[PDB]
Amino acid sequence: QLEDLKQQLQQAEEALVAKQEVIDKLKEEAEQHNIVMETVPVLKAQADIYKADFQAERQAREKLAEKKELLQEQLEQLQREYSKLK
Amino acid sequence: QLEDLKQQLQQAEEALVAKQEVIDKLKEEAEQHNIVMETVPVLKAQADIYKADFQAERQAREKLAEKKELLQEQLEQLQREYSKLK
């Protein structure tokens, strides 16, 4: 009854070495994974900065386009008004 | 002792359940990591699309800003010419 236990205990003792080595591999991979993981909030923040730059630029171009068209009309009307007096 | 051995055997059998779940946790985290990693080429593609649109937008804005400045000078100049005749 004692020898019977002694064998199933040494078997389980080796099975803990077998499982600790699996844990030790997965943990080392986990640290390599984490450094890579650090990059993701950085790429996300970069994508946001480029979207905002584009959106601000687009807004500026549209407003600028409106003013130019407005200026052109004023210039044409004024050229016509001036020609009448010269 | 038979009693000492009994405890050590049920504290090795339970320690294998305790180590398998450490393995099962690390493996489940590994799959959640790989899912976050898949986002990397997506954030990179997004940044590139926005970066290109921003650059195309900046060039159109800079051409529009050159024309608007020219019109403004043409307008202030014509205002000066007109004011001379009243």
Swiss-Prot record, chains A, B:
For region Leucine-zipper, the annotated ranges are: 64-85
- Result of mutating residue 71 to P? Abolished ubiquitin-binding
The reported result of mutating residue 67 to R is:
No effect on MARCH2F-mediated K48-linked ubiquitination
Tissue localization of expression is: Heart, brain, placenta, lung, liver, skeletal muscle, kidney and pancreas.
Region Ubiquitin-binding (UBAN), as annotated, extends over: 1-86
Record annotation: effect of changing residue 57 to Q: Greatly impairs tandem ubiquitin binding
The entry's stated outcome for residue 86 to R is: No effect on MARCH2F-mediated K48-linked ubiquitination
Could you say what the effect of mutating residue 68 to R is? Abolishes MARCH2F-mediated K48-linked ubiquitination and subsequent suppression of antiviral and antibacterial innate immune response
Cite the location of the cross-link Glycyl lysine isopeptide (Lys-Gly) (interchain with G-Cter in ubiquitin) from the record.
Answer: 6, 19, 25, 27, 34, 44, 51, 63, 67
Q: What is the effect of changing residue 65 to P?
A: In IP; diminishes interaction with TRAF6 and polyubiquitination, greatly impairs tandem ubiquitin binding
Glycyl lysine isopeptide (Lys-Gly) (interchain with G-Cter in ubiquitin and interchain with MARCHF2) cross-link: located at 68
Q: How is it modified after translation?
A: Polyubiquitinated on Lys-27 via 'Lys-63'-linked ubiquitin; the ubiquitination is mediated downstream of NOD2 and RIPK2 and probably plays a role in signaling by facilitating interactions with ubiquitin domain-containing proteins and activates the NF-kappa-B pathway. Neddylated by TRIM40, resulting in stabilization of NFKBIA and down-regulation of NF-kappa-B activity.
Q: What does this protein do?
A: Regulatory subunit of the IKK core complex which phosphorylates inhibitors of NF-kappa-B thus leading to the dissociation of the inhibitor/NF-kappa-B complex and ultimately the degradation of the inhibitor. Its binding to scaffolding polyubiquitin plays a key role in IKK activation by multiple signaling receptor pathways. Can recognize and bind both 'Lys-63'-linked and linear polyubiquitin upon cell stimulation, with a much higher affinity for linear polyubiquitin. Could be implicated in NF-kappa-B-mediated protection from cytokine toxicity. Essential for viral activation of IRF3.
The Swiss-Prot or TrEMBL note on domains reads: The leucine-zipper domain and the CCHC NOA-type zinc-fingers constitute the UBAN region and are essential for polyubiquitin binding and for the activation of IRF3.
Look up the record and name the associated disease: Ectodermal dysplasia and immunodeficiency 1: A form of ectoderma dysplasia, a heterogeneous group of disorders due to abnormal development of two or more ectodermal structures. EDAID1 is an X-linked recessive disorder characterized by absence of sweat glands, sparse scalp hair, rare conical teeth and immunological abnormalities resulting in severe infectious diseases. Severely affected individuals may also show lymphedema, osteopetrosis, and, rarely, hematologic abnormalities. The phenotype is highly variable, and may be fatal in childhood.
Q: What name goes with this protein?
A: NF-kappa-B essential modulator
Q: Which organism is it from?
A: Homo sapiens (Human)
The top of its lineage is: Eukaryota, Metazoa, Chordata, Craniata, Vertebrata
What is the covered span of the full protein?
259 to 344 of 419
